[PDB]
Structure formats: C-alpha cells, structure tokens
Amino acid sequence: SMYKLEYSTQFKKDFKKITKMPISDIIEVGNVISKLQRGEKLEPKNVDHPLTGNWVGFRDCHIKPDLVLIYRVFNDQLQLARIGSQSDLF
Amino acid sequence: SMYKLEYSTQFKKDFKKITKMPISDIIEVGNVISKLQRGEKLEPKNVDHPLTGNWVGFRDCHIKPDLVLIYRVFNDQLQLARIGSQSDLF
Amino acid sequence: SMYKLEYSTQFKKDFKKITKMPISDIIEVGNVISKLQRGEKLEPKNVDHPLTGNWVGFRDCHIKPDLVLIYRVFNDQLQLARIGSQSDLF
Amino acid sequence: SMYKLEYSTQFKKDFKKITKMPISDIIEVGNVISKLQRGEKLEPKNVDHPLTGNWVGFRDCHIKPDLVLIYRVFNDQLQLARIGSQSDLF
Amino acid sequence: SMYKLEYSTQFKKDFKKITKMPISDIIEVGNVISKLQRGEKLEPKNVDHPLTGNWVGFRDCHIKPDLVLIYRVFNDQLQLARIGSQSDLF
Amino acid sequence: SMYKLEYSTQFKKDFKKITKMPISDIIEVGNVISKLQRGEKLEPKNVDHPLTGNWVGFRDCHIKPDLVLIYRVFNDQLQLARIGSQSDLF
Amino acid sequence: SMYKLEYSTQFKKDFKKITKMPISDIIEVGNVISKLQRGEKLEPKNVDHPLTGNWVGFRDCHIKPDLVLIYRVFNDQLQLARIGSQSDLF
Amino acid sequence: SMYKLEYSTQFKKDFKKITKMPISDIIEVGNVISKLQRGEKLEPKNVDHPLTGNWVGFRDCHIKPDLVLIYRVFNDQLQLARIGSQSDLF
Amino acid sequence: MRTEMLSTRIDHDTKIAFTNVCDEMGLSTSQAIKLFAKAVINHGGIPFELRVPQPNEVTASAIQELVEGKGHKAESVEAMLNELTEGKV
Amino acid sequence: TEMLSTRIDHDTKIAFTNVCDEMGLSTSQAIKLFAKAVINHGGIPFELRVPQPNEVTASAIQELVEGKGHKAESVEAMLNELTEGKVKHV
Amino acid sequence: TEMLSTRIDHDTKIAFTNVCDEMGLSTSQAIKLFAKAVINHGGIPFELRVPQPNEVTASAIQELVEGKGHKAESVEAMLNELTEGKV
Amino acid sequence: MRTEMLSTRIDHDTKIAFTNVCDEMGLSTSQAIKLFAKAVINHGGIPFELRQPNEVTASAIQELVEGKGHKAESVEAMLNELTEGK
Amino acid sequence: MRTEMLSTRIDHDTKIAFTNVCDEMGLSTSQAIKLFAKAVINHGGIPFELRVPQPNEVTASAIQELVEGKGHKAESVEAMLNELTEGKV
Amino acid sequence: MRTEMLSTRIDHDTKIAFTNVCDEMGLSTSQAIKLFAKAVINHGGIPFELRQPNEVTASAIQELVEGKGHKAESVEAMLNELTEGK
Amino acid sequence: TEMLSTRIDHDTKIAFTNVCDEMGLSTSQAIKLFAKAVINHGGIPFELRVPQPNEVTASAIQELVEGKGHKAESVEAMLNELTEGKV
Amino acid sequence: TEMLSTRIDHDTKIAFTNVCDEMGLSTSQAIKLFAKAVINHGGIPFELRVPQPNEVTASAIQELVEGKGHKAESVEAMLNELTEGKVKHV
DSSP states (O other), X not given: XXXXXXXXXXXXXXXXXXXXXXXXXHXXXXXXXXXXXXXXXXXXXXXXXXXXXXXXXXXXXXXETTEEEEEEEETTEEEEEEEEOHHHHO | OOOEEEEOHHHHHHHHHHHTSXXXXXXXXXXXXXXXXXXXXXXXXXXXXXOSXXXXXXXXXXXXXXXXXXXXXXXXXXXXXXXXXXXXHO | OOOEEEXXXXXXXXXXXXXTSOHHHHHHHHHHHHHHHTTOOOOGGGOOEEOOSSOTTOEEEEEEXXXXXXXXXXXXXXXXXXXEOHHHHO | OOOEEXXXXXXXXXHHHHHTSOHHHHHHHHHHHHHHHTTXXXXXXXXXXXXXXXXXXXXXXXXXXXXXXXXXXXXXXXXXXXXXXXXXXX | OOOEEEEXXXXXXXXXXXXXXXXXXXXXXXXXXXXXXXXXXXXXXXXXXXXXXXXXXXXXXXXXXXXXXXXXXXXXXXEEEEEEOHHHHO | OOOEEEEOHHHHHHHHHHHTSOHHHHHHHHHHHHHHHTTOXXXXXXXXXXXXXXXXXXXXXXXXXXXXXXXXXXXXEEEEEEEEOHHHHO | OOOEEEEOHHHHHHHHHHHTSOHHXXXXXXXXXXXXXXXXXXXXXXXXXXXXXXXXXXXXXXXXTTEEEEEEEEXXXXXXXXXXXXXXXX | OOSEEXXXXXXXXXXXXXXXXXXXXXXXXXXXXXXXXXXXXXXXXXXXXXXXXXXXXXEEEEEETTEEEEEEEETTEEEEEEEEOHHHHO | OOEEEEEEEEEHHHHHXXXXXXXXXXXXXXXXXXXXXXXXXXXXXXXXXXXXXXOOHHHHHXXXXXHTXXXXXXXXXXXXXXXXXXXXX | OEEEEEEXXXXXXXXXXXXXXXXXXXXXXXXXXXXXXXXXXXXXXXXXXXXXXXXXXXXXXXXXXXXXXXXXXXXXXXXXXXXXXXXXXX | OEEEEEEEOHHHXXXXXXXXXXXXXXXXXXXXXHHHHHHHHTSOSSOOOOOSXXXXXXXXXXXXXXXXXXXXXXXXXXXXXXXXXXX | OXXXXXXXXXXXXXXXXXXXXXXXXXXXXXXXXXXXXXXXXXXXXXSSOOOOOOHHHHHHHHHHHTTOOEXXXXXXXXXXXXXXXX | OOEEEEEEEEEHHHHHHHHHHHHHTTXXXXXXXXXXXXXXXXXXXXXXXXXXXXXXXXXXXXXXXXXXXXXXXXXXXXXXXXXXXXXXX | OOEEEEEEEEEHHHHHHHHHXXXXXXXXXXXXXXXXXXXXXXXXXXXXXXXXXXXHXXXXXXXXXXXXXXXXXXXXXXXXHHTTTO | OEEEEEEXXXXXXXXXXXXXXHHTOOHHXXXXXXXXXXXXXXXXXXXOOOOSOOHHHHHHHHHHHTTOOEEESOHXXXXXXXXXXXX | OEEEEEEEOHHHHHHHHXXXXXXXXOHHHHHHHHHHHHXXXXXXXXXXXXXXXXXXXXXXXXXXXXXXXXXXXXXXXXXXXXXXXXOOOO
16 A cells, blocks of 8 residues: 555545445455555556546556546555546546 | 657647656656667567558657657658657547 | 759659650650749649648649649759659559 | 641551441541641540550540540651540550 | 328337427427328428438438438338437438 | 526536636526527527437527537426536537 | 249349340249249358348349349249349449 | 350451460460360369350350450350450450 | 638538537537548548438338338327327327 | 469359459459559558449339339249240240 | 457347458458557547437436426526626 | 528638648538538438547546545545445 | 430649540540449449548659658759650750 | 530439439539549549440450351361461 | 469568558458459449550550551541541 | 457557547447447448548658757757656656
C-alpha cells in the first residue's frame, strides 16, 4: 500500500453501482486497486494502458471486460477518477 | 555520430499533451527518440516501420501501443513530425 | 532570375514516350517548363493548381488536356517529377 | 495547296466497314478528312486531341461519337492510320 | 373500398416502442395508415416515395421527419413492414 | 392559463451548468421554456422535433446549436427532463 | 409431388441466349431445373445456396461455373428469375 | 479424329503468329485440337469452359495460360474460330 | 482566427431528420458538418460510398415475412392500434 | 521474379477465368493489376461485398413475387418454347 | 498472442459466417481486418448503432413518467430558484 | 417547396482546403454538405470515423487534478465505506 | 423505345481529358455515361469513393527522389529537351 | 470560362431510375455525371466494373456460324498448311 | 483445389506484402478476396491500366512512321477508291 | 450463444482496446457492431486500407521536408522546452 489513496466524488457515486455487483466482483475491484497502490504490474487480461486525447495523464484498466477503472499515480498518490462501463465513462 | 534534432511546429503542440503524462512516460518518449538519434535499431515492441504512402520516407513507431511517433532520418537530421494517438495522427 | 532545372529519373523515362510526339508538341512542353522556371503565371487552359492529395507540395498543370506535368518549386529549383497522361500518373 | 494525303494499309482495310455505312456517314468522314487536310479546326463535337497513350505521336478525332479517326500531321503530310469504333482501335 | 390490413411480426415489436409516444403522435401514425389503406395520396410533408434500393416494391413515408413507415400495397392488402427511426430501419 | 410546469431532479442538477453561463443565454433558455409552456411554435433554428430513439415519448429542441432541451407535454403538463449539450444528454 | 413451373419475362429473354449453346448444355440446364422442381438436393458442384440480401429467399446455383440460375421455391411454385453469367446477373 | 475439322479465315491469320512459336508449343496446340476432335475431355490446366455473353455457343480452352483457343463442336464438326492471347481475342 | 460559414439549402424534412441523427450520435449539426469537412480534407475525398437507404437485416426479414404471406391480420386501423398499444387507445 | 498465388476451388477458378478472359486479360495480368492497384491506393480499391443483383435481376424477382410470372406445365414444354424448338425433350 | 472476442447468438453467427464465405474470408480474418481498420483510422470507419441509453437521461425521464417531477409556479420563479438568484 | 439552411462556422484555412478538395472532385461545397446530410439520414448514422466527450469523467479528472480528491486510509476502509458494509 | 438525353455542363479541359480516357478504354463517352447510370441504378449508389487525384507508386517514387535531393540537373530547358529527346531538338 | 456539354441518349425507363436514385442520394443527374467524368479523369480509368467487344472474334464466329469455314482433312494437314511446313 | 497465380518482380512483391500486412491480411488472402470480388461483380471493380497495344493499330502506325503509307491525290479520289465507287 | 474471435498480437490488442474504450464501447460491443454491420450491408462497409496521415500530420511532414522545422541540440534540451521544464533530463 506504498502510495496514498485518493478518490473523486464521482468515484464514490460510481461505487454505488459497483456495490450492487456480487461480492466476488467487488473484491476483485479491490484487488486490482491494491496492486496499483503497491506499484505492481497488472495481468494481461487487465489490458492496462495510458489514455490519449482529453484523458491524457490518466490510465485505464479493465477489471472486467466491461468494467473499467480510470486512475493515475500522481506524486505519491493513487488517484481513482471513475469506475464503470465503457459507455458510462467515455 | 548523432543526428541533428529537428521537430515540426505541430510536434511542439503535441508535446503540450505529452507533458500531461507521468514523468515515466515522458522519459520513455525521450528514450525512443534518443535511440533514433543514435541511428540504433529499435526493439520489436516499438513496431517501427515505414509508412506505405507518398510520405517521403517517414516512419511510424509505437512508444506505447496508443502513443505513436511519426519521424524520418534525412541527411543527418532526425525529423520529428507528430506524436500522439492513432486518432490524432491518422 | 531563373530557378535551377532539375528532373527525376522517372521524368527521363517518361520523356522516352513524350519524344514520340510531333516536334510542335514537344516544344509546347518546353515552353510551359520555361514559363515555370521564370515564375510566370500559366495560361487558364493549363489548369495550374496545387494538388490537395498526398502530393508533398507538388503541382499539376496541363500542357494538353491529357498531358499533365507534375512539378514543384523548392528553394530556387524547378523540380520536374513526371510528365504523361492521367493514366500514367494517377 | 494543302497537305499531302497518306493512309495506311490498315486504313484501307477499315474502310471496308466504312463503305458498308450509309452515304451520309461516308460523306461526313470525307468532310472531316478534308478539314484536317486544310489545317482547319474541327468542330467541338469532333473532340480533336493528341494521343498520350500507346499511340503517342498521333491524334484522334470523333467523326461520330462511336466512329474515331486516328491520324497525324507529319511535316506537310496528313497520315491516316485507322478509322473505326473505340473498341477496334484501342 | 379499403385494402386488408396486414402487419409484420417486427411491426408489432416496433410498436412496442411507438406506444411510448404521446397519444397524439400515435393517432397521427394511425391516420397516415388509414390514408394508405384507402388509397389516398399522402401530404407533401410525408415524402411518400418508392425505395430504389433492394426493397422489393416497398415504400417509405414520414409520419414525422424521424419516424418512417415501410409499407407496400400488394393485391388489395396494405402490408406494414416496419415503423421507427432511420437508425432503426436502415 | 398555460400548461403546468414540471422539471426533473436531474434538470435541476443540469441547471448548475446552465447558471454558470452568461445572463443572455440563461434568458434565452427561459424564453424557449415560456414559448413551450404557451403551446407556441418555436423558431426554425430551434429544430423542435419528437424523439424516436432511446427517449421516445419525449421531444427535444435546440436552445443553442449545442444546448438541447429534452421535454414533453403530457396532458396539461410541460415536463422538462434535461438541458445540456448533445454529448451529456444522448 | 412436383412444383408448378413459373418463369419471369427476363428468363425467357435470357433463354434466347441459352438457345445458342450446344444441345448438351441446354439439356444440363433442363436437368438442373428438373431436380429443383422435384425438390431434390443438388450436387456439390452446383454450389447451390441462398443469396444473402433482401432477396426474399431467392437462391443461386451454378449449372456451369459461368452459367448461374437465380430461382426460388415459394408455396408449390418453382420460380425461375434469371439464367446467365455472373456479368449478366450481378 | 471422329469430328470433321473446320477453321475460320481469321484462324489461319492467327496461325501466322502461332507459327513463330517454338515447335513444342505448335505441337501442343495440335494435341489439344486432336483431343477436341476425338471428343475427349481436356486437362485441368486447360480450364476448358463455355463462353458467355456475345460469345455464347462457343468454348474457350487455355493451351497455355496466355494462349487461348476459341472453338465449338457444331453437328459433326469441330470449328476453330480464333487462337491467340486474351488481349488479342477479347 | 478568421471564421467563415459553410452552408447548404435543404428542405425541412431533411434538416430535422439529420438533426435527430446527430443528436442521437452526441453531436451538434455544426460539429457534424465540421467533422465531414475535416474528414474530406484528411482523406482527399468523401470517405464513404454515396448511396440510397438500404434495409438492415431486421427490415429485410420483416419484408420477406410479408412477401411470404406470413403477416398478421388486423380488422381496422383502430383495433390494430389498440392491440399494439396494449390499450393506450 | 517470384510468385503471388492463392489456393482456390474449381468453381471459383473457372468463374474467375471466364471474367478475366472476357476482359481481355490472362489470370496473371489480372492478379498483377490487382497487386499494383493495391500498392497504388494503399488499400483494396473497392468495398468487399456479397453478389448483389443488378436492376434486370431485381426486376425479374419483383415480377415473380408479385405473381406476374409465366406458367409452364413441364421443364420439357418450357424448353420447347424458350429454345423455339431446338430442344424439345429432356 | 492475445484474442479479440465476443459472444453472439447463433442466428447472427450463421449470417455473419455466410456473408464472409461469399466474400472469400473466414470470420477470424474478417474480425482481424476490422481491428486493424479501427487502428488504422483511429476510429470506427462506419455508422454506429444508437448508443446505450444515457442512464442520467433515462432516470430523469423515468422520474417524470412516474409523475415524480417538481412543480414550479412560473418560468421566472423556476429560473430564480435553479439559478440561485442570477436571473 | 419548403427549404431551410443548414450551416456551420469553420476556420478560413479549413474552408479553403475543403473548397479545393471539392473542386478537384467536381462538386461545390454546398452540394457536398447536402450529400453528407442525406448520407447520414440514409445510413441512420455517420458513415465514417468520429472524434468521445464525457462531462462526468472530465469533471472527475478535473477535481482530482485540482487536488480536491478524498483521502482513504486503505483499500479495505475505502471499500467498506463505499459499499456501506458489503 | 422512348429515348431522352442525359447531360452535364463541363469545361473544355474536362471534356477532352474524359474523352481521352474513354477512348483509351475502348468506350465512347455516351457508352461510358450509360454504364455509369446503369451501375448507379444497379448498386443503388455511386459504386466508388469520390476523391482527388492521387499519385500512383511510380509518381510517389519520383517525388520522393526529388524531395531527397537525388534529381538530375539540366543547364537549360533547351539542353534538357535535346538530351531527353535524343536529338529530336 | 469555357464550358461545353457532355451528353448521352438513354432510354426513358433508365432516365427515371437514375434520376430517382440520384434524388435519394441528394444530388442531380447533371451533378452525378460531372462527378463521374471527373472521377474517371482523377483515376485515369473507370473505377468500377465494365461490360469486352472484339470485332475480329465476332467476325470469325459469324463466318463459322454462317457455314463458311474452311475444311481440313486432319489436324496434321491443317498444321502443315498453316505453319507453311514447320 | 487449384491455384490462381502470377509471377511478379521482387520489388512489387515486397510492396504488395507490406501493404497487406498493414491491412491485416496475407497476400494469398488478398488475392482470394480479389478473385471472389471479380466473380461477385462479374467484372473487375476498379480502374484498369491502359490496355496492351492494339496490334492492328500499332502496325498501322508503324507502317506510317516508317514512311510506307499510300498516297492519294484527293479526298474524293481516296473515297472513290476505298469505297469502290460508292462515293 | 457462441463466439466470434480472432487471434491478435499485443500491440494490436491494446491499440484497438484504446480506440474502442474511447468510443464508449467494450471490445465485445465493437465486434458485435462490426458483425451486424457486415450482415446489414452484405459486405465490409468501408474500404480496407493502410494508415493515412490526416491534414495536420501532412502539414508537419511538409514543414519538415521544406526545411522549416525547429532545431534542438539534444533530446534533453528539447524535453525541457516542450515540457516547459517538467522533464529536464533523460
């Protein structure tokens, strides 16, 4: 948990939708965020990549094929911008 | 030994976007450009290849899968035309 | 004064075909090129214009409706790329 | 005092098909040939033009929309190569 | 008198969407269909016309600029194939 | 005596962004809403139309080319669902 | 047992060309059509398959690789639309 | 040699070009014609097939990939129409 | 800096139908026209084939079902609306 | 020189050969034309698509589906009429 | 090597396979061509289907249809409230 | 007949380039724009590659970039609060 | 039976350049226009993308050789014509 | 300015169909024909499928069909005559 | 199964291979797509190169350029001879 | 339900995923859209082609080839200016 953890207001509002998912999926969200907090590279299926265009400076990982986390590491802080479907986030 | 460094006006504009990326990624951009300046061969993941148009020998390589550098070596000049996503360049 | 005359290897090969034309038509080609070398505006029938395609600044004029010259002025140089029919060039 | 008249052997063979045509059309062929022999401009509908394809060095005019004459003026000679439809000549 | 009314299975499914419209708009759909059943010419705003594509004799009219009816008259039968937006149908 | 006025919660949230706009634009929003409340035709530039997509049962008009109001008249009520740009509403 | 035989006007026109073929080939055309009339399955070389358009179930089979029959079975009718080369039909 | 042998005037004129070919090629022309005269099926490489369009009623075989024979069997007679390249014959 | 205007004359039906598609696509009409103009410059041509409306697969199947005589009858426009609107009248 | 080739089935081989011959091209010339066109265009210079009936075919299909075809009691009687007596049986 | 994949229903897979067969390619080759085209254009080079419903707009509409909107006496009163006095 | 205008503001450089490409193709800019509008209607969509903007994501990113995000003591504490105990 | 006329207004340069391509293709201009009209009816649209002239590969290579500074010099138009016409003057 | 006319005769049915397809695409038949001519020039060729006629082959086929071909006693005799002894 | 094949020079094969690679297909797949397109359109769906020279026209031109044409005194005399008296 | 899939390399997988996410689509949604579009159109509804630079890229390339680029003595000094000091080395 080397980085500090910060999240947007919108991230909390997104997590109201995430809360409705099965417990397994919620823990997998937490496991991905924990990997990111420790600075660890994600799995190939997470297709982790930097964002282009207006979203430049931020990254996107697939926790599930249709469940995307938008985040960045800035200074010493893992910042969580949004979590949701491709259609909800872009 | 090393090529002269030349960049387009648009390249400077593109680097305004590049500046918003984390320092790690900016350093990777610099590392690729420096390899090219030394005339060295790039690594397979950079998928360096010439473009097959009337593009006077310009080339395309991936600094990241969605971060493309358009460039050429002419005389003893490394000329940097664009840097950005496929959507920005094509 | 006048620009330097320069022609491509392919322009020489194209002229292998142009030479078969009557001497009058060959002279008319030469007259158009002489105008271009002196910075003279061509005649309305020459439909002189820059190409908007992938042409890197090159221009198109008609010595005849079906005899096209592809050329540019770079520095103080009249560079002649091709001469031939629309089918030969496009 | 006009140009001298010359025709190819193949032109003589083509004229068998021309002879099969109505007198009106044969006369129109003769009228175009006389205009060319006198150096006179043909009508807009004859779309007289130099050839820049396989028959470079020669000209073609349309005596009818589907009846083409391939010819040239070389020095003081009007030389008639072929007469027929677009398919039989190209 | 009047043609027989016939509608496709897909027309019923499309009407699952049309029913959500205000009652006035639903009546206007019904009025256009009633005109067609009685062989009446539609109004200029209905842009009634046969489709020139692969449509097997079917026609297109606009109940609204973005609400299209695909239909035909065969024998004495008004056959209704689809109703919906241009995006739903084409 | 005009239609009753109703707006959604989300419409109230959208109006925070509207409040950030110049007074001129806010007033133009109010003017369109009053026209709709009185049952009056909007101007051609408002391109008022019923929706036949995901928001079937509702109408949209353009208060500005990039500022859209989604609304309906249901019985004696003018109901205002959203106001914003095309991207935020569709 | 057997389907009713129906053919288009254009089919009769096409058979004017078919008539010029040798008797052997005309007999092969007849043999294929008779197999279809009996509802039988064709042989692999006839590459019988439905067309994938809005073609109301019409099918394509090769009596020869360059002799195509367009047909359908509707009710108890074998309906023959076209016979000819790919260039005549498509 | 069961069929009688007949050839067009144009076939003889074509054979003046064929005569210039090596002896091996001329004999192979004769071998194909002999197969046809005996009613024998040709080899797969001869891609023997009936002609469509204006040439219907006649057949085409490749004696070489760019050497085509146009022929037919009519009554008891093998009739040879033309021999030459695809560009010469079509 | 300098700004000009690009425009065309079109009838009302076209303007509304085009506006509706653009709205459903998340675009203003001005944005859409600028995208077309830029795409034409980028491609050196119109980057799609010009064509008439063509039925999508669902439409083609509806048409074939009708042409095969497999449609569903209705006694009148009113009864049809009542059934398919499930009573909305 | 090296080779470009593809493996194809017999029906495709013959149908392609017929179109190519009738266009005045050997198979090799046609493939060379395609490869050079792909180079010239930087892509396949046409849309890939399934066969689509031309207007004449669509007309025949429309005549049939509207019940306006021509009846025949047997393949044999149909052959007698469409061949004008050339093939009176089978 | 990795995969680009989707689940489709049976009828769609049949129709897609048949169309590709008539064009002369396999479904895998067709999908690879699509992916490379999307990369080469930096976008999807053809018309998109009407998007998934904007949930924000959908909820606003559902609230209104369920009769749960907020009444206002006037446009002026509404603007005063929703602009917090700016107009 | 009832015709209206369909129009956009565009930069001068863009106007020139678009006009020149249309000239080489043999049509006017007005005709080209009408062709585009009818094509969009005929396809029920824009038949070539677009851009997507998203206001919600843009605001979230902007809030974080301005240093106004919310701290969490651990992933476990964050999940516990944001799931309300799940 | 009934015959009409299809026409367009084009400048002289276009008419001759188009006529020359059609002749080289073995077609009259009337035949070519009828083929286009029939192809448009057949396809329900224009069966090619509209675009500006684009250099073929030989042209692109000529341009790149010039842009790379690898062209061949000539002292004057007259000497150039003399060399490349091999004395035709 | 120097403009000329480019024109064809076409059947009435063809005219109607072509006009209707052009209407649905949003352009006039004159504009469509200009677009075709410029496209043919811009590509140096016709950018879609043609038809090929051949007068020589047509005459040869017609001569045979009319029963006017030349008899040969055998393939060997034919080759001997047509190759002048090769 | 049979083949569609041609011999090309080395440079052309290289360029064709590279273009197909950028599109995401092999040269064999590209040529199969071309063959099926040619069949599906019943013609070649793009512009043809200027054809091989019509040998009849080429020989007529060569005869004239070599100075071997037939002189005529007049257009009327020419027409009388070449029409065998019809004009 | 069954599956449509293709094997792709890592660079292609990520570059495609970025375009798809930024278009508001999961990979599955994008492939389903393509397959349904191919069905709807009876073909691939776009030309296959290599990447082609947009106007901005062509402009940068033209500026460079005309010698109007901007010099820099090292990758490091270039990074300092283009990032406005954010990355002053490597």
